[PDB]
Enzyme design. Structure first.
Site, short mmCIF file in Angstrom:
data_model
loop_
_atom_site.label_atom_id
_atom_site.label_comp_id
_atom_site.label_asym_id
_atom_site.label_seq_id
_atom_site.Cartn_x
_atom_site.Cartn_y
_atom_site.Cartn_z
N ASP G 41 16.80 28.35 22.02
CA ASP G 41 16.99 28.50 23.46
C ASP G 41 17.54 27.21 24.07
O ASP G 41 18.56 27.22 24.76
CB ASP G 41 15.65 28.87 24.11
CG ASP G 41 15.77 29.17 25.60
OD1 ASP G 41 16.90 29.21 26.13
OD2 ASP G 41 14.72 29.36 26.24
N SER G 42 16.90 26.09 23.77
CA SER G 42 17.46 24.79 24.12
C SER G 42 18.03 24.13 22.87
O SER G 42 18.09 24.71 21.79
CB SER G 42 16.41 23.90 24.76
OG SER G 42 15.39 23.57 23.84
#
Ligand SMILES: CCCCCCCCCCCCCCCCCC(=O)OC[C@H](COP(=O)([O-])OCC(O)COP(=O)([O-])OC[C@@H](COC(=O)CCCCCCCCCCCCCCCCC)OC(=O)CCCCCCCCCCCCCCCCC)OC(=O)CCCCCCCCCCCCCCCCC
Ligand SMILES: CCCCCCCCCCCCCCCCCC(=O)OC[C@H](COP(=O)(O)OCCN)OC(=O)CCCCCCCCCCCCCCCCC
Lengths: 90, 167, 141, 458, 114, 101, 86, 74, 57
Positions: G41-42
């Protein structure tokens, strides 16, 4: 996000379309229009300086003795090279 | 801001203020994974209060260790020669008051302009009235249907679509 | 040519919900804490009902902040509260409330005493008592 | 003399007698000509002043001051033309008549030969001015400016006529200033204060002290189209000079009570300029300049000891122009954009490039760069008023600071990017915009070459 | 010093019922841009917060005023006060300087100006 | 910015000689231009009634005259090249070199 | 005045993204959809714009992060910022 | 025009970039490796250091010192 | 447009004009030659030495 598909990719063919219209240079698009029409170059320095140097001094030679006390120029600062002995050297 | 992406705005700036502290180009690079280690230490766990201490204590240890005069990326929200060039600013619609003999120049360009207007001359009857159909009452962010369902002309014409360039 | 009820009337309260927002929406729900309240310390005619005050301070901050314009250029439709000091004011600094300048500005004030002395180089200090003699002490010849 | 009143009254049926639209150019053409007559026999002495008739010495006095008064008339019809073209000719014939009907008395006054022609002609205006404010206003707050403009000016100027009729029958005849060669002094009593106070306070209510100026921005904020009579009302005010004819004499020796007029206007001079910084309405912003470095003359006049009159005269006609001309800018920029709210106009200086150097030379003469008249009119103030007491250097030294932040903030507000929503503001200052805005900075700076023509006798 | 300025405080989770503080504003920026985007306008916008910004500030006080609270009779400590002071400062001078100009001569004889 | 500068020689042969001459000169003038300027002060007026603080105070400022220079020398003229790619540098400039010389 | 085109931006972006040994330089360049190379996600989306700022260097706005799904989308609007191809 | 081509640097060198080994005791490792290593190599490996930077060869000094010293010379 | 006369650099370290640096280096002498006369002939101080005024007699 997907949703920008149908949008702003129109802008890519719209913004870049305006900018497409924008750049133009045939036919000299400054018409201009109308109309007509280095060694010397020896009077340009003369029209520059030699006009004033005349005018400014004509305002002086006819002048300095007109004003009762005009330009104040100082003393000679005489040294014992005229009427004097040294006498030292001491 | 949705709770998910709240670390990004920190994760964007975290290394940002870092590099203005480091000097050698490797120094930034060598501490990358090393300080990158701390993020995923707890990678998958609660979204709420359990991991809010990854948000909570992130406040301190950041603001502490802040303002070593960061690198500002000159053209940007701040810092030198960002908004510098206004002496042009492209005042779009300068084409009104002329007194031709000033209009002799760029004849092909004067031809092109009046061709753009026809779109904005009448695009409206379905352009405006669709916004009376599109947004039922209190609609949030106001753009039309992204196509406007057949041909947008522009529709946002032309203030956003023809807007001013930079030189 | 706005016809009726242009501006604030005799507040602070008549129906706090009647004002914001009848027109002039400072608060949405009549309580945003933007309700046309902030007539703090009245009897001063200053700032009547006023779809207005104490909304917070220190700047419009003039950054990306880009719904459309949002701060000092581009003029969002109607928020206006208090202004005119906002073009010569910004936000939080890195440190907080350390006066070390009055310290440093008085740092030299330590050396006020260094003023009452002299710097005379020749001769040295050479702890003395009655050896000082700036000019003369005893007889001339 | 009749060399002047007669042609300028001869103007009066040069106007209606004419045809349709030729009217404006008809009278603007002639109205300039009189300026040759203006100088014509004037700017004689000099020493042992000119008096050419029994009840007129036009201006000798070294208060020439009359040449300007004859300027501003055919600066109006170039100024006033904008929105006055939208109503009828028989009314447009009026507004040019009463406007002259003013110009006729300001020639009568400043001469007057005496005290008692001054007064009845000192109060003889307010018939022509009051009628220009109330009609042809803009807002509906004008109706109150009608009253406030009276009920001060007239309020305390009646105690003149109680006093000046008290002198006429006390000592000889006031019929003539040029005979004061018998004047006894005024020593003290609880009667004489009033005499001195009656012969004074009527003048103060015109050139404002920091009290009782409550009218000055009320009339200027809301006032005729072009500043059409707002240029004239910046002549009227400074014309309170006559205090120069009195306080020189006619109770010379009471300075005893001067102090409540010193410390009252001397701390306002540092004051009302500072309440001018946050103003949101532009024709207000200039109206408070007009108090400030006008009210400095009231500490120039009360003090005796010339080097003040050297500097007090240059000021009456110093802002006489600069403070005039600014009301001419803020008019124009208002033609195009119909709010007088200062904020709204921003992002100019791109769109009207030639009018850039017009703001600048205006806002530069409140700064008073050294060479122009402005400082050489202020630095004879400070030189005598310093000798009064050394401490005056502070406050009036502060005046020279807040006034600089004062002026710039007005210009620098019009340097910004704003494209914003305006589709208006197309007109690139058609000549009258820049023609009538000239005939100020050209004649103003010019005088600095031979600035012995603006000075008192001392 | 001026001020904390409270860049962190209590929160979480109370007052999460407080919503539509944005619905207040989101209505307008929808309506404002519904105003601000139109083909034919050529003119400024009403912007009432400015109309109520001056008119509730310059005018609309002496109407609202009452001469009652002695914090509004404060001004005697402000308006008149120092104006007496400046008289006290001066009137001593212009005298102390005057007395000496009579008995004794402070100045030189090359002062003609004044 | 003094960050993202690089070293002494990347197509800047002449201009970097202009720095290390002048930025040497301002350092107390060993034989150079102002040898009669900064040098003839602390050696002359320094024998006087001086406050016995400025002597402490001024001569300490003389120190930083080095680190003034050497700092903006060592980040710009010394370290490895650091700055984004596509750098077009051209110093062949008749209307410039004419000026420095 | 410096000449700018649409090729280099397809190259440069292809370039450093092909420089990272975390990505094999057989992988898609113009369209991978980046969700295959979004992990996790990051540390991808904001991770990839950390380097790309080091060459052009304007600000990389926040809300433009979610346009970064399409590898043709990142290069897409960078043309509209710096006034790029016709 | 394709000049910014990859498959070029891919660090071998750079005692400052050998910290990948130093961090291998934890490990990342390089990735992304060659960005800060873009110009790390090439003729940028020399970068003349102290006084030899401000000598610039000391060229004319000890060769031209006696250039005037000296012809008569008595 | 204007001309191609020099192309930019991808950090291939652009070439010099070869009269760029030599024409400059002749001004690396004017500091190193003009520093000649420092120690010749001048010492750290050319002064004369204060001889400790012993004659208090
Ligand atoms: C008189 C005092 C002159 C000295 C002060 C003025 C400084 C020069 C100036 O005007 O700068 C304009 C320049 C205009 O800037 P801009 O807004 O970007 O230009 C917009 C337009 O192009 C419009 O602005 P501009 O820059 O183009 O100015 C117009 C000017 C531009 O063309 C020029 O000729 C330059 C004028 C400079 C010297 C003017 C005559 C000097 C005597 O054209 C003319 O000069 C018209 C001919 C006038 C001849 C007058 C002969 C005597 C009557 O800067 C200023 O606005 C401020 C000027 C004041 C400077 C400070 C003065 C106190 C020190
Ligand atoms: C206040 C009203 C009080 C006035 C007191 C009476 C005035 C007076 O007596 O005048 C003194 C004197 C004339 O009276 P007298 O002393 O007999 O003269 C000698 C004649 N052989 O000498 C005079 O002739 C002076 C007469 C003129 C004074 C008239 C004005 C006095 C009050 C002016 C107030 C100033 C403004 C205040 C009003 C404005 C607001 C309403």
């Amino acid at each position: 996000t997907p949703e920008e598909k149908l949008r702003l990719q129109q802008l890519r063919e719209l913004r870049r379309r305006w900018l497409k219209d924008q750049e133009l240079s045939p036919r000299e698009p400054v018409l201009p229009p109308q109309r007509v029409s280095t060694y010397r170059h020896s009077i340009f320095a003369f029209t520059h300086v030699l006009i004033p140097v005349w005018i400014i001094h004509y305002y002086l030679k006819y002048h300095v003795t007109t004003k009762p006390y005009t330009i104040v120029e100082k003393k000679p600062r005489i040294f014992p090279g005229d009427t004097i002995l040294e006498t030292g050297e001491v | 801001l949705t709770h998910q992406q709240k670390v990004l705005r920190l994760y964007k700036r975290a290394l940002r203020h870092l590099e203005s502290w480091c000097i050698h180009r490797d120094k930034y690079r060598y501490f990358a994974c090393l300080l990158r280690a701390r993020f995923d230490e707890h990678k998958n766990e609660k979204d709420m209060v359990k991991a809010t201490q990854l948000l909570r204590e992130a406040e301190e240890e950041f603001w502490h260790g802040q303002h070593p005069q960061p690198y500002i990326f000159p053209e940007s929200p701040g810092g030198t020669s960002y908004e510098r060039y206004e002496c042009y600013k492209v005042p779009e619609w300068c084409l009104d008051d002329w007194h031709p003999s000033e209009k002799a120049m760029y004849p092909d360009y004067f031809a092109k302009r009046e061709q753009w207007k026809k779109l904005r001359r009448e695009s409206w009857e379905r352009e405006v009235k669709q916004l009376q159909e599109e947004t039922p009452v209190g609609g949030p962010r106001t753009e039309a249907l992204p196509p406007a369902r057949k041909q947008g002309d522009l529709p946002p014409l032309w203030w956003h679509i023809v807007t001013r360039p930079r030189e | 040519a706005s016809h009726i009820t242009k501006d604030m009337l005799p507040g602070p309260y008549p129906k706090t919900p009647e004002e914001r927002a009848a027109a002039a929406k400072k608060y949405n729900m009549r309580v945003e804490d933007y309700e046309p309240y902030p007539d703090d310390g009245t009897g001063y005619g200053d700032y009547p009902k006023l779809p207005d005050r104490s909304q917070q301070e220190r700047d419009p901050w003039y950054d990306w902040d880009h719904p459309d314009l949002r701060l000092n250029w581009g003029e969002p439709m109607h928020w206006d509260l208090d202004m005119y000091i906002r073009n010569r004011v910004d936000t939080s600094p890195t440190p907080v409330n350390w006066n070390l300048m009055c310290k440093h500005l008085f740092g030299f004030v330590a050396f006020m005493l260094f003023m009452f002395w002299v710097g005379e180089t020749y001769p040295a200090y050479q702890p003395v008592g009655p050896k000082q003699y700036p000019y003369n002490n005893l007889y001339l010849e | 003399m009749l060399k002047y009143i007669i042609p300028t009254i001869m103007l009066m049926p040069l106007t209606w007698l004419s045809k349709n639209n030729m009217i404006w150019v008809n009278s603007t053409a002639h109205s300039l000509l009189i300026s040759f007559t203006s100088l014509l026999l004037m700017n004689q002495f000099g020493d042992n002043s000119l008096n050419f008739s029994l009840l007129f010495f036009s201006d000798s006095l070294s208060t020439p001051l009359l040449i300007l008064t004859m300027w501003l008339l055919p600066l109006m019809l170039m100024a006033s033309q904008h929105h006055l073209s939208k109503e009828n000719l028989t009314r447009k014939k009026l507004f040019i008549t009463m406007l002259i009907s003013l110009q006729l008395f300001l020639i009568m006054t400043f001469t007057a030969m005496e005290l008692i022609l001054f007064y009845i002609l000192f109060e003889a205006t307010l018939v022509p001015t009051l009628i220009i404010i109330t009609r042809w206003g803009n807002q509906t707050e004008r109706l109150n400016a009608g009253l406030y403009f009276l009920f001060y000016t007239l309020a305390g100027s009646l105690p003149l006529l109680v006093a000046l009729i008290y002198i006429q029958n006390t000592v000889g005849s006031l019929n003539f200033l040029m005979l004061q060669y018998w004047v006894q002094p005024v020593h003290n009593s609880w009667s004489n204060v009033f005499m001195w106070l009656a012969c004074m306070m009527a003048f103060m209510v015109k050139m404002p002290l920091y009290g009782l100026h409550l009218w000055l921005p009320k009339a200027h904020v809301e006032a005729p189209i072009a500043g059409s009579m707002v240029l004239a009302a910046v002549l009227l005010k400074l014309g309170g000079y006559g205090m120069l004819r009195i306080t020189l004499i006619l109770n010379p020796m009471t300075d005893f009570m001067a102090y409540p007029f010193i410390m009252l206007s001397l701390w306002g001079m540092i004051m009302t300029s500072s309440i001018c910084l946050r103003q949101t309405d532009l024709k207000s912003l200039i109206a408070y300049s007009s108090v400030s470095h006008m009210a400095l003359v009231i500490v120039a006049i009360l003090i005796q000891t010339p080097w003040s009159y050297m500097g007090a005269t240059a000021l009456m006609i110093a802002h006489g122009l600069t403070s005039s001309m600014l009301f001419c800018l803020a008019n124009s920029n208002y033609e195009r954009i119909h709010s007088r709210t200062m904020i709204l106009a921003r992002g100019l200086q791109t769109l009207l490039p030639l009018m850039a150097t017009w703001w600048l030379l205006a806002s530069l003469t409140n700064l008073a760069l050294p060479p122009t008249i402005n400082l050489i009119g202020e630095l004879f103030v400070v030189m005598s008023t310093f000798s009064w007491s050394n401490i005056t250097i502070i406050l009036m030294g502060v005046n020279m600071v807040i006034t600089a932040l004062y002026s710039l903030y007005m210009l620098i507000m019009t340097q910004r990017g704003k494209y914003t929503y305006h589709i208006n503001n197309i007109s690139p200052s058609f000549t009258r915009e820049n023609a009538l805005m000239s005939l100020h900075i050209l004649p103003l700076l010019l005088l600095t070459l031979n600035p012995k023509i603006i000075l008192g006798p001392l | 010093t001026t001020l904390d300025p409270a860049e962190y405080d209590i929160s979480s989770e109370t007052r999460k019922a407080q919503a539509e503080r944005l619905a207040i504003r989101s209505r307008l920026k929808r309506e404002y841009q519904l105003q601000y985007y139109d083909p034919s306008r050529r003119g400024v916008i009403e912007d009432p917060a400015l109309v109520r910004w001056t008119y509730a500030r310059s005018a609309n006080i002496y109407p609202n005023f009452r001469p009652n609270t002695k914090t509004s009779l404060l001004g005697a400590l402000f308006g008149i006060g120092p104006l007496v002071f400046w008289y006290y400062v001066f009137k001593t001078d212009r005298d102390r300087k005057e007395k000496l100009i009579q008995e004794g001569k402070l100045d030189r004889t090359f002062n003609i100006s004044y | 910015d003094i960050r993202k500068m690089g070293g002494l020689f990347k197509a800047m042969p002449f201009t970097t000689t202009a720095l290390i001459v002048g930025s040497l000169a301002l350092t107390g003038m060993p034989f150079l231009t102002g040898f009669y300027s900064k040098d003839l002060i602390i050696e002359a007026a320094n024998t006087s009634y001086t406050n016995a603080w400025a002597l402490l105070m001024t001569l300490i400022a003389t120190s930083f005259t080095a680190i003034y220079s050497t700092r903006i020398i060592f980040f710009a003229l010394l370290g490895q090249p650091r700055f984004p790619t596509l750098v077009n540098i051209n110093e062949n400039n008749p209307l410039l070199i004419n000026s420095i010389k | 005045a410096p000449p700018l085109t649409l090729e280099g931006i397809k190259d440069r972006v292809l370039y450093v993204l092909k420089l990272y040994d975390k990505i094999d330089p057989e992988k898609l360049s113009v369209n991978s959809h980046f969700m295959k190379d979004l992990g996790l996600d990051s540390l991808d989306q904001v991770e990839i714009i950390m380097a790309m700022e080091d060459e052009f260097g304007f600000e990389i706005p926040d809300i433009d992060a979610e346009k970064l799904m399409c590898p043709q989308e990142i290069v897409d609007y960078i043309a509209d910022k710096k006034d790029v191809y016709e | 025009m394709e000049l910014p081509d990859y498959k070029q640097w891919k660090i071998e060198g750079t005692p400052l970039e050998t910290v990948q080994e130093k961090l291998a005791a934890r490990g990342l490792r390089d990735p992304w490796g060659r960005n800060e290593a873009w110009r790390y190599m090439g003729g940028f490996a020399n970068n003349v250091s102290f006084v030899g930077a401000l000598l610039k060869g000391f060229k004319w000094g000890f060769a031209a010192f006696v250039v005037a010293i000296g012809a008569e010379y008595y | 447009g204007g001309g191609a006369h020099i192309e930019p650099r991808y950090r291939q370290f652009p070439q010099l004009t070869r009269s760029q640096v030599i024409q400059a280096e002749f001004f690396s002498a004017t500091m190193w030659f003009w520093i000649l006369w420092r120690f010749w002939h001048d010492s750290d101080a050319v002064l004369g030495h204060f001889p400790y005024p012993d004659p208090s007699q």
